[PDB]
Amino acid sequence: KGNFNVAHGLAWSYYIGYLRLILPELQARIRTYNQHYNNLLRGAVSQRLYILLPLDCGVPDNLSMADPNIRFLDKLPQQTGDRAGIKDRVYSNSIYELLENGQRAGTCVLEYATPLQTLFAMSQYSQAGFSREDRLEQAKLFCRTLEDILADAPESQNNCRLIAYQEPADDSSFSLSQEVLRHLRQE
Amino acid sequence: NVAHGLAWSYYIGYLRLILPELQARIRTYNQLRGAVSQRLYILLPLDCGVPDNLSMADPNIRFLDKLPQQTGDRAGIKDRVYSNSIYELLENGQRAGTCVLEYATPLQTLFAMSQYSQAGFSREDRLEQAKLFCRTLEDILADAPESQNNCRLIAYQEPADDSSFSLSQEVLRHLRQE
Numbered sequence: 001k002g003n004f005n006v007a008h009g010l011a012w013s014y015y016i017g018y019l020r021l022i023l024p025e026l027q028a029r030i031r032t033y034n035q036h037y038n039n040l041l042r043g044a045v046s047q048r049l050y051i052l053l054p055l056d057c058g059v060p061d062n063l064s065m066a067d068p069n070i071r072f073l074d075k076l077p078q079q080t081g082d083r084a085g086i087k088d089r090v091y092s093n094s095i096y097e098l099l100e101n102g103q104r105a106g107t108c109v110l111e112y113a114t115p116l117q118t119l120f121a122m123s124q125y126s127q128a129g130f131s132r133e134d135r136l137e138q139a140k141l142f143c144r145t146l147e148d149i150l151a152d153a154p155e156s157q158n159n160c161r162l163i164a165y166q167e168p169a170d171d172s173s174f175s176l177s178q179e180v181l182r183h184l185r186q187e
Numbered sequence: 188n189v190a191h192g193l194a195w196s197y198y199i200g201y202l203r204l205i206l207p208e209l210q211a212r213i214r215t216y217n218q219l220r221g222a223v224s225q226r227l228y229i230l231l232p233l234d235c236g237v238p239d240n241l242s243m244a245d246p247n248i249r250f251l252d253k254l255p256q257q258t259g260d261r262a263g264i265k266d267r268v269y270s271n272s273i274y275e276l277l278e279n280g281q282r283a284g285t286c287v288l289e290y291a292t293p294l295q296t297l298f299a300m301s302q303y304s305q306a307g308f309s310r311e312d313r314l315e316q317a318k319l320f321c322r323t324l325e326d327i328l329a330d331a332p333e334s335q336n337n338c339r340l341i342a343y344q345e346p347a348d349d350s351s352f353s354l355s356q357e358v359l360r361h362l363r364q365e
């Protein structure tokens with residue numbers, strides 16, 4: 001229940017401070033990108049933000065380094081907002097091409113859920129104290145709470161997909177692009 | 188335990204990343220008008236009332252300029268951008284100081300949290316977690332290698348309907364003591 005409270009808090013933080021701010025205008029930015037910059041008839045950027053939730057909270061900062069079949073392609077147009085005294089705080093998202101048998105098999109806006117980096121740290125540093133098994137518990141509850149939030153959130157309208165999975169980023173037999181592609185091909 | 192996550196979040200996902208590069212962005216900014224102070228000033232209003240425009244809290248806090256942007260690859264975002272704002276502090280219509288200044292955004296998150304039924308967070312929960320957030324953040328930075336006299340936290344209560352309080356005067360008091 002204390003792993004509940006931490007995870008509950010980070011999921012609400014993630015919604016209040018990011019998803020609720022960017023999901024309203026996401027499809028507009030994607031549409032702008034597809035109309036004017038990407039006229040590949042089978043290579044349109046898909047309409048949803050894909051959010052990676054590795055349940056071990058192992059979050060590399062470079063997505064491309066994690067898999068050879070993920071290639072960094074471009075950025076969406078930036079989104080700016082005055083926030084808590086910061087003028088023109090920048091919200092940015094990255095577009096990736098997903099490769100399969102040397103072909104561009106998918107194109108999407110893709111990123112990790114950055115709160116998982118905090119769950120990982122607090123299982124690393126004594127002053128936070130959490131167990132690795134706390135971490136794993138908190139990650140599941142984070143995903144579950146986030147799922148709950150998005151289900152009822154007006155800003156989420158077929159424009160966000162959570163991709164939760166157990167495999168480390170270290171793992172010999174796991175393809176991150178294949179994980180993303182399987183979900184993409186379901187829409 | 189909500190405030191503990193948010194405090195570690197603010198350190199792990201922000202303060203530890205920007206504080207090591209702060210002294211150099213300020214030096215790059217210093218190209219006559221006044222030297223900026225060496226420290227990031229972080230406002231921690233315990234009522235979690237966090238306006239997006241600082242002049243809305245005090246018209247004597249006026250925006251002056253931005254630092255040069257910091258970029259970093261983060262959680263799959265290429266060149267995530269970290270920006271900060273330089274403000275002047277007026278006293279009798281005239282500039283008395285300038286500093287990099289912002290609110291701790293997790294406190295805005297606690298406030299909005301407490302406004303949403305599904306978060307299950309009372310106004311009383313909110314103040315208690317505001318305090319815990321400040322105490323946690325402080326205990327973290329006391330030990331953090333990246334905090335090297337490059338950050339100043341200002342936590343404060345001001346009751347409802349009380350304008351005896353000048354945020355600009357209070358920041359000026361801290362700048363003058365340092």
Ligand SMILES: Nc1nc2c(ncn2[C@@H]2O[C@@H]3COP(=O)(O)O[C@H]4[C@@H](O)[C@H](n5ccc6c(N)ncnc65)O[C@@H]4COP(=O)(O)O[C@@H]2[C@@H]3O)c(=O)[nH]1
Pocket residue numbers: 013014017018019084086089090091092113114115117118193196197198199200201202264267268269270289292293296
């Ligand atoms: N003042 C200031 N504060 C920042 C900044 N950067 C992070 N902070 C805060 O420091 C702590 C760890 O931030 P972190 O990134 O780990 O978590 C975030 C993140 O996942 C997501 N978010 C938000 C913006 C965003 C983005 N542009 N791109 C991708 N994700 C994004 O929403 C969470 C809560 O955002 P919030 O804003 O309320 O507080 C966070 C959080 O308390 C910053 O530049 N300026």
